């Protein structure tokens, strides 16, 4: 909930990779931290690139999505928090944002980073503190 | 439904975590 150093280092990765995930357009000197961009990024492409097909599935599924993003990223990481499963919901989150550009309309697209950034947070924040953000990554 | 993709969320997360160090 608490706007930090934290809610924002994450949010400044998740908001340049979203903005270049929708336009196609090089974030990679507007971030405040390059290296972790250049990773996290690949780590996005990655998952996209093999389960774009069961995210256009799994979205097709689910009516009235935007407010269903805390749940899904709390029911993905309550039991147990990983890097894994904290890049999977930025990746599907991207996705969702693409989605809903795609449609048209942009309002949401300019929430989605701090809607996924403050879920993230709600439950992960100390996790993250603990291993200085992005640092635990690397 | 968004039960089922927290799952996929998870299961995504997990295979791509033991993969990768």
């Known amino acids: ?138 | 439904p968004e039960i089922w993709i927290a799952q996929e969320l998870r299961r995504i997360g997990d295979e791509f975590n033991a993969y990768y160090a």
């Open chain 1, 1 to 138: 909930v608490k706007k930090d150093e934290i809610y924002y280092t994450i949010l400044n990765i998740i908001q340049n990779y979203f903005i270049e995930y929708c336009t196609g357009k090089n974030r990679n000197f507007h971030v405040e931290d390059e290296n972790t961009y250049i990773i996290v990024k690949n780590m996005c492409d990655i998952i996209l690139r093999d389960n774009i097909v069961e995210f256009r599935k799994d979205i097709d599924r689910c009516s009235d999505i935007e407010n269903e993003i805390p749940e899904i990223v709390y029911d993905t990481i309550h039991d147990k928090i990983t890097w894994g499963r904290v890049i999977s919901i930025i990746a599907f989150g991207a996705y969702v944002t693409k989605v809903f550009k795609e449609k048209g309309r942009d309002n949401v697209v300019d929430l989605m980073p701090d809607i996924i950034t403050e879920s993230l947070l709600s439950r992960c924040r100390s996790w993250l503190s603990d291993q200085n953000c992005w640092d635990g990554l690397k």
